[PDB]
Every structure is written in structure tokens, then in C-alpha cells.
């Protein structure tokens, strides 16, 4: 592994966490 063991393509926008 240089990245993650199985692929997980972005099929949805990123939704960061900004709250508790």
C-alpha cells in the first residue's frame, strides 16, 4: 500500500466537518 488497500473513488463532493 502506497495509498489505501482498496479503491474508493470520489463519487460525491467533499463534506468537511466544522462542528463538534
Amino acid at each position, epitope marked *: 500500500a502506497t495509498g489505501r488497500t482498496h479503491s474508493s473513488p470520489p*463519487r*460525491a463532493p467533499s463534506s468537511p466537518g466544522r462542528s463538534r
Partner: antibody
Framework: QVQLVESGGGLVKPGGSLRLSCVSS????????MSWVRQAPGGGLEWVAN????????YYVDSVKGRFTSSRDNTKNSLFLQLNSLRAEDTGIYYC?????????WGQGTLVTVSS | DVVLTQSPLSLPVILGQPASISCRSS???????????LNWFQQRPGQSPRRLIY???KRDSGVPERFSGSGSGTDFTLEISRVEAEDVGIYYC?????????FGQGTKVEIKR
């Protein structure tokens, strides 16, 4: 063999509605995300919409949010795109595609014209 | 969005010669899972795009071996070792590593005869 057969495109006034259809064969339709991609005339490809396997996740490019909704019917092998409040720039060939971001198989295209 | 810049925008080629398309990304193209989701498409007049290359360098099943993908970081390259007449048309690169999916503006390959 994977087939994506599209239909439903035509002439429609600014602000009108039109419903694109994609009927697939040759694969397990419910295993794939599907995706719509449009090509403005003499133009580049623009991604439009994603829809997950069962329809619970639907994402859209910004220029269309609130105006387009995708849908799918896995017992009918069918993928739809409901166009609404159409604008001059929604004109183009609309393509059904399989499995973003791989896009391994494409429908034959269906032309959408927005005109008075 | 990521901007993919293709060059040259129009590529005239003598039949039988090498031909090379560049794709310069305004961003690295490695998704959080470590993979680069970069594709090349060929489009012939009045036809839907045909996928030639996926994940930088993997060739799809239909595709002749004269087509090859390569590159890393922000430069990627499509490469037709031996150009044939059937290869006229428009070629697009396409990145999928960062939301949302973006295409290059397309390079037209024309035969010099």
C-alpha cells in the same frame, strides 16, 4: 455486451421541461452508479449528474442544482434525467454513462434544443 | 475545479508518425485513497466518446496497442506511436480525482497528406 440506449430529447421552450431516459442491457444495472454528461454544441464535455446504485444519493453540477433531478428504476434497467427551467445553455447532446469516474460505457447521445 | 489544459489544440500528423497529446493539470491528481483517476477519450464525428485509457496508463479492451497513457504529478500524456487514418477525431483527457469531474478542452488530430 453493455448497451446504453437513450431517448427523450427534443425541442423545448426556455423554462420548459423535458425528460431524458436511458435503458440499459447486458449488465447488472443495480451494481453501478450512473452519471449524465452533456456536450454543448461544437463544445467540450461537461459532467452533469451522479446517481448511486439505488437512488438515495444524487449529485449535480452547480449550474443545474434545483433544475435537474436524476432518478432510476432498477427493475426496469432505466435511468432518467428530469430537466426543468431549461436555459439557452442547457442545449447540447446529453450522454448517459456508467460508473463515474471510470465512464467505461456511453449511451449514443440524445439532443436537447432549448429554443422559442 | 481542476483545470486540465491540453496541447497542442490541433495536432496535424503525417500518417505513420508518432503523435503526442499533453494534459497539464492545475493540481495534482491523487485522491485521498492514493489513486489517480485520469482517463483519455476519443470522439469521432457524430459519435459518443470512446474510452481509450483509464488510470493514467491502463488501456481498455477494445483499444489498439498504438495508444498509450503515461505521466504523473500534473503532466499527463497520450501517445499514438503510429498514427493511422482512423485516428482522426477529437481526444479528451478527464480527471476524476477531485470533485467535480472535469474534462480537457479536447485536441483534434488531423492527417497531413
Amino acid at each position: 455486451q453493455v448497451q446504453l440506449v437513450e431517448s427523450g430529447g427534443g425541442l423545448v421552450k426556455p423554462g420548459g421541461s423535458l425528460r431524458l431516459s436511458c435503458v440499459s442491457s447486458g449488465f447488472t444495472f443495480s451494481n453501478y452508479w450512473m452519471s449524465w454528461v452533456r456536450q454543448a454544441p461544437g463544445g467540450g464535455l461537461e459532467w452533469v449528474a451522479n446517481i448511486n446504485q439505488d437512488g438515495s444519493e444524487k449529485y449535480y453540477v452547480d449550474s443545474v442544482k434545483g433544475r435537474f433531478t436524476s432518478s432510476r428504476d432498477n427493475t426496469k434497467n432505466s435511468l432518467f434525467l428530469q430537466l426543468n427551467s431549461l436555459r439557452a445553455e442547457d442545449t447540447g447532446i446529453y450522454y448517459c454513462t456508467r460508473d463515474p469516474p471510470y465512464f467505461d460505457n456511453w449511451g449514443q447521445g440524445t439532443l436537447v434544443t432549448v429554443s422559442s | 475545479d481542476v483545470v486540465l489544459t491540453q496541447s497542442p489544440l490541433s495536432l496535424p500528423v503525417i500518417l505513420g508518425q508518432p503523435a503526442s497529446i499533453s494534459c497539464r493539470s492545475s493540481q495534482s491528481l491523487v485522491y485521498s485513497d492514493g489513486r489517480t483517476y485520469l482517463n483519455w477519450f476519443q470522439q469521432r464525428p457524430g459519435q459518443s466518446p470512446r474510452r481509450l485509457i483509464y488510470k493514467i496508463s491502463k488501456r481498455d479492451s477494445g483499444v489498439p496497442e498504438r495508444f498509450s497513457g503515461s505521466g504523473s504529478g500534473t503532466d499527463f500524456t497520450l501517445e499514438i506511436s503510429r498514427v493511422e487514418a482512423e485516428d482522426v477525431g477529437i481526444y479528451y483527457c478527464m480527471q476524476g480525482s477531485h470533485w467535480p469531474v472535469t474534462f480537457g478542452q479536447g485536441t483534434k488530430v488531423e492527417i497531413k497528406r
